[model samples]
Target: KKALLVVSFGTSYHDTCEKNIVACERDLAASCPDRDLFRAFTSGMIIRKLRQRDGIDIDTPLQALQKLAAQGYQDVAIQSLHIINGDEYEKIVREVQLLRPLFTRLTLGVPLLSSHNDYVQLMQALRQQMPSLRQTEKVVFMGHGASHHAFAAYACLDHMMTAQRFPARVGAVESYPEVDILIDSLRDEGVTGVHLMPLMLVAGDHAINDMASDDGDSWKMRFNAAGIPATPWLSGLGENPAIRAMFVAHLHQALNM
Candidate 1:
């Protein structure tokens, strides 16, 4: 039998796991019922935390591939739940490459924003789903930034959002355009208020602690103190139906659909 390995960065938030991550898994399994489905996590930190905290055991990519090989599943498809082909996605790619010879066939799907067409479709989807905004308010998206070359994806997405005239902008927590940079951008746009949402797969730590927290250093606090009253939006990108559709379509393409 063929096998499918769905890999994600993994979230400890059980509610989001059901609504976002596992929701995509269900879509995949529904699309191809005959394939044996498996789950793997790319984040060792999250994996260990889930195990120690919740008694949930999710295999790492290496472990999952070993299990698939042991079970004699020659044909396999690996789907990445990462939004961009950044460091996390590249880590998964390297692991798959190392284990390629063990499988008769192994195919990997592109990240959510992998192609020019993907970006175009993404902008369309985001435009349709982003929250309505007042004239003086801007919606800012928080992405887990990368220092790797793939950091360009965040900037690319930001440009796409801006070019389409969506009242939305993107910022990174780790890389360029941290909250301070975004505040400047907002000022240049003559914004009065700001709404913040995570551009990540799950509205986990970064969303709750960094973007929405009342901590003085948090985005919300910073924005409010800057005279731009901030409202926090805790939804993750994966919660969007359009994003789920993109995942299904990418997996279909990986499997020759």
Candidate 2:
């Protein structure tokens, strides 16, 4: 049996991704009953941030891995929860790749949102999440877009945001894919006030710098410049159950592989 290491850019929301990590661990235990499961966080800063603000001693990814290794586990499989194969994911993957030789046995699965199926499920999950809002306001999801990779996935998300007629639009910061199309759609529909939300793992850098920034480039600024009122609700994606399940599914695939 293989040991598991579920990793993410751990959230400061103690109850958000915290619950996700726990639930994912339980699901893994149920599926691979014989295997020992461990957890890790790529963002130690986020964990520290949460601890400072929320008084929660959230565990970092490295800490979780250390604890498990100390407990005498081997044959590790690392599962990642990342928006894309961007900086954060690459960093952790690099670390794992470097340590692979030392481990003598290991499996490093692709990023959680690395596959077309993962993207498909993500779109599905977002569609289902509409019911949670249960209103007619056009949904604007702000994802952690990358500047260096193929922003095709971001384009896919932007298209899916409106093409499906779900009363929504999606956009990104840092990625080439812009919210202009969504803005055009909303403006075409004469949408004035908008409900904004982060499409990231946690309410971190992107949320602060891109979504809610007071600067001219922030989502709020950009949208407001477009004459649409932006109501930014920056929170952890893990705060939502559907999103957590998405992470769990990714974990399952990694462990099985």
Candidate 3:
């Protein structure tokens, strides 16, 4: 029970692994040196790599909690590194809930950027890269927007941003925060030009395929069909200091530390 577990989706890129995710864990652990830190990943490849380096397990935080409980440890805090509250986030929460009966006290970290707090924080992070747009232009974000009950949460962000009156328009593709709605809304707002960017931690799969690709049906093409020009920003969110700060805030919320 006397350990802190940081669970991440894990990364294939060595550079991202070192600078983005691992640095986050180190930052947290260094702040709380009183506790032992264990890092686990959802990806098997990453688990193998880390374990090969130092025997870290692929076992989820839930599994680690059980093992720790068996070993007479009575305290555990789990911080999720998930970008959103989709299947993986739900899985982690469900597992922790099932294990709750066995622990005296268990603390969980909020999924990174899950709430409006995240929306504002993320917006602030990308402001440096966010291009200025006229009333005829809008800012678009292509996210890994998953198909899940949590899908609707993205709308909450749209509402929040619009309420706060941010100069740029922000939205995501796929699932919860549907891209079409953003486009349609912008069209209604008389937006004629669009700047597209990835709302993802890494400019990975979703960025390249659904966003900046030059295929006939890619985002670039979609905007063309809509008679709006698309400027895609394919950089990942991980490198942004503001985005990374959201993780720090999330960790603070999780541990209440």
Q: Which candidate is the best by TM-score?
A: 1
Each candidate's lDDT (Cα)? Answer: 0.85, 0.67, 0.70
TM-score of each: 0.93, 0.73, 0.74
Question: Mind sharing the TM-score for model 3?
Answer: 0.74
Shift in Å, residue 75, candidate 1: 1.5
lDDT by residue (11-105, candidate 3, tens digit) is: 65566567667767777676667778877677667667766876655675666778767876667777777667778878888888998878777
Inter-residue clash pairs, candidate 1? none
Please give the lDDT score for candidate 3.
Answer: 0.70
TM-score, cand. 1: 0.93
Q: Write the per-residue lDDT of candidate 2 for residues 1-257, one digit (tens) a residue.
A: 45777777676555545455565556644555667766666666876776788886655555655555566666777777676766777777667666565455666656646776777777777665453443435778887656554366677766665566666677777665677766776777778667777776667667877788888888888889988877777665655667667666666666566
Name the 10 consecutive residues with the lowest summed lDDT in model 2. Answer: 128-137
Q: Root-mean-square deviation of each candidate, in angstroms?
A: 1.7, 4.1, 4.1
Model 1: per-residue Cα lDDT over 24-125, one tens digit each: 887876777778889998888999999999899999999999999999999888888888877788898899999999999998887898889988887676
